[PDB]
Amino acid sequence: MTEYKLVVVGAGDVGKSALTIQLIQNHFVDEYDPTIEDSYRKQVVIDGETCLLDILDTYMRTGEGFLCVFAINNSKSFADINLYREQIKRVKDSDDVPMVLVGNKCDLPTRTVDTKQAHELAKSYGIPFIETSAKTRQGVEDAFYTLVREIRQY
Ligand SMILES: Nc1nc2c(ncn2[C@@H]2O[C@H](COP(=O)(O)OP(=O)(O)NP(=O)(O)O)[C@@H](O)[C@H]2O)c(=O)[nH]1
C-alpha cells in the first residue's frame, strides 16, 4: 500500500501532538501525558484505496504533505503560520506543496483568531482550511484525509 509522509507543524502548544494522538489513540492528551514520540504509522482507507499514514509529530525534506496548525485562542500562532509555510516552501523547493491549514482548539468557548481571517489566509495560499478539536475529535479525521487527497492530486 502507498505510504504518505505527513508532517504536522505549528507554534508551541497549538495541539500538534494532541491532534495526531486523537487520530491514533482516540484520547485527548495533555502535558501530564507523554508527547515525546517522533512518528506514528496507521493503516487507513481513503476514497476506497488503502494506504499507510506515516505521521511525523515535530528532516522535513521528505514530507509529502503538511498540516500547518494554529490555535484559535493564540493570535501569535496564527501570525506565525506564514513563517511555517515559507519554511516548508524552502525545504521542498516549491511554491506549492500539499498542505492544509488547521485552526485547532475550536471547542473552546472563547477565541482570539477571527475565523473569516483564517478562511482568507487559506484562500490566499490556495489550500483547504479545516477547524479541528483534538479534545472533541471535530475535524480531526477530515484534516488528515483532506491532506492525503491534496497529495494524491499533486
Ligand atoms: N481545548 C483544547 N485544548 C487542546 C486542544 N489540542 C491541544 N490542547 C491542549 O493544548 C496543550 C498543548 O497540546 P500539545 O498537543 O502538546 O501541543 P503541541 O503543539 O504538540 N506542543 P509542542 O509544540 O510543545 O509539542 C495541552 O494542554 C493540550 O491538552 C484542543 O483541540 N482543544
Ligand SMILES: [Mg+2]
Ligand atoms: Mg507536541
